Symmetry: C2
Subunit: 360 residues, 2 copies
């Protein structure tokens, strides 16, 4: 059975389990089940399933080198699919809530969930809660007796919390830290002192890298009972590095990729986001450029957003990006090599994770 | 040491642990730690701590009859305090998110969190996420090696998910079920066919009773290693019954308790909530009363809200409430007695839970 068809089939299985349980145990009526079914589909499906399929790919790597009964290979692959769905649903939680937080319009060429006519924010906040609750219901049902259950739950928990901390870093990235105060409405930074590579790295490490790269790799290790084939400090290091590169790419696309192919009108500039473009631009700009950036960034006025795009175009940020890309290629190659000392197989899965990221 | 001082001290301990960990492990800066400290205080403190203190009270009941070393009594009480905080923080998550969902103004005489000037919805949604994440970080830290950890995490998980399902039942309670549809904006019911005692019971069972009464009782059993002193079907039954009565009281207060003592301008009528008052009124009204109710319910216009209050006043809902109260007293007394077959002690804690509810 091909990996993706397996993964998509387990989606159906898991959906039926969750909805059946709501009927048999939570007194749900068919109409509200249908609402939840549709919500699950609309929020969990239609992506590339990069995160969930990474769990499956890591598990298949180990299966190719490890002795097991056929029934055991099937159980491992079924666990890797369930685990991959837990990550997809965790992502779905964060996208639903983030889209509401940010007042986003579209995602992936379709309206954000909360904008659907029969949803609204009042329902969608809670729908997003349920999405994450489902990840736990999946875990406790399908992995009840599994030896990795504790480690899996503890890992998921930490990754979720890292993610929420990252969200906080992201939403507060255009404030001056010394001005944060629940009692006082927050002004936009005027000095941009906090738009540094290190501050940037912190936002991205927490907001994206733990759930997008660390969790799918480590979950693949856990459902394979293979966390001893690796040095976990190396898996963290490579996860954080690849994940940073992924976000840098997303940041550049927000600005320069056409909306119909982006899936989204990009608003990082209007939103005054600490993007890789802003940070890199400030890291090379002269006094005049810095002042022009300050007078135009974080404003909805299209003339001003086009002044910022003009500044980024003239500043030859392609050069800084090629240089960044080259260094990331060095370091990820170095880490893959360190990963071979303990597991060729696992190192190869990380290679494939890297190729899928670097090429897209 | 008195129970409450113990409980409040462990709040400080737990806060310091969470914030210290954010500094040492999540790269937080002091300003954002301060923001989180303030958020935690503002959202978790200032109530009566009924839920968390119930965990402590149940544990103290068992301590009085069970042989242990002093260090063991201290550890049990410290676990009951930590567990009680997990429930308080779970409540805080749900109040923050609910207040945003419902567009609420105040809670407990103070603005809802999201309305604070330096918070806003964008931050508050995520602050509420973090509140719940903290419950897990507490559990995994303080109970890492405890024999009840699995059962505690599995119980908490189920109670959380019940709660979210209850929220969904609540927010959709004024829609016609057969009209729920993410694609179509939802009209208010015109027939009120779904304003029944059984539908009401379902909303309340899930939205409030699992986290308010079932979880504090069962958590007290778990940190005491005493879940064998009880018949768990009886603990569920009594939890759901008491919790229903609690909500009935809250529903009546929303309408009739003065705002400065309610802590809140009540808006159940404008919000077209399936309240105990609406359901009970519809259960005794004549044709003319039903039609007048329909023409005025779920409208912001103060003249119409006062027409609904007029209808409830004239309908002698005090009588139906005394009758309800009397039956709840019967059944809760019957359940407490069934609870004595296996645990006098546990039955007495449920008695105290009931007195604190019935009198307030
Ligand atoms: N049979 C066996 C025994 C002990 C370890 C590994 C294996 N295999 C190597 C060939 O392909 C995977 C199974
Ligand atoms: N949050 C997380 C998830 C998975 C692995 C490790 C972590 N942490 C790294 C930094 O904070 C302490 C532990
Ligand atoms: N000492 C003892 C032995 C076996 C069971 C219970 C007890 N106690 C009864 C008196 O108060 C609580 C401790
Ligand atoms: N959600 C929950 C929490 C604590 C105990 C039991 C439950 N459930 C009762 C009905 O649904 C199945 C299990
Ligand atoms: Zn966002
Ligand atoms: Zn982006
Ligand atoms: Zn509400
Ligand atoms: Zn109320």
């Amino acid at each position: 059975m091909a990996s993706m068809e397996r993964f998509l089939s387990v989606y159906d299985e898991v959906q039926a389990f969750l909805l059946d349980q709501l009927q048999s145990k939570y007194e749900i009526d068919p109409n509200r089940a249908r609402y939840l079914r549709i919500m699950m589909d609309t929020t969990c499906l239609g992506g590339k399933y990069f995160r969930g399929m990474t769990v499956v790919n890591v598990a298949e790597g180990f299966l190719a080198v490890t002795q097991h009964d056929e029934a055991t290979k099937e159980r491992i692959l079924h666990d890797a699919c369930v685990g991959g769905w837990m990550i997809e649903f965790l992502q779905a939680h964060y996208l639903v809530e983030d889209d509401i937080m940010d007042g986003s319009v579209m995602r992936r060429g379709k309206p954000c969930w909360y904008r659907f006519p029969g949803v609204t924010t009042q329902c969608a906040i809670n729908d997003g809660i349920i999405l994450k609750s489902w990840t736990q219901i999946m875990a406790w049902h399908y992995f009840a007796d599994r030896p990795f259950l504790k480690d899996l739950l503890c890992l998921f928990q930490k990754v979720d919390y890292a993610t929420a901390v990252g969200q906080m870093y992201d939403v507060t990235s255009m404030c001056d830290s010394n001005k944060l105060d629940p009692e006082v409405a927050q002004p936009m930074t005027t000095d941009f002192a906090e738009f540094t590579p290190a501050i940037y790295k912190r936002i991205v490490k927490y907001k994206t890298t733990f759930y997008t790269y660390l969790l799918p790799l480590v979950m693949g290790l856990l459902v394979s009972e293979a966390a001893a084939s690796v040095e976990m400090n190396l898996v963290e290091r490579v996860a954080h590095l690849i994940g940073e590169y992924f976000q840098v790419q997303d940041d550049v696309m927000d600005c320069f990729t056409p909306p119909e192919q982006l899936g989204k009108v990009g608003t990082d500039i209007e939103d005054a986001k600490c993007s890789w473009l802003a940070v890199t631009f400030l890291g090379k700009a002269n006094a005049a450029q810095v002042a022009e950036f300050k007078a135009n960034y974080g404003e909805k006025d299209p003339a001003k957003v086009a002044v910022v795009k003009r500044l980024y175009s003239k500043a030859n940020l392609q050069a800084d990006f090629a240089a960044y890309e080259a260094e990331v290629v060095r370091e990820v190659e170095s880490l893959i090599e360190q990963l071979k000392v303990k597991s060729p197989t696992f190192a190869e899965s990380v290679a494939v994770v890297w190729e899928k990221t670097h090429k897209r």
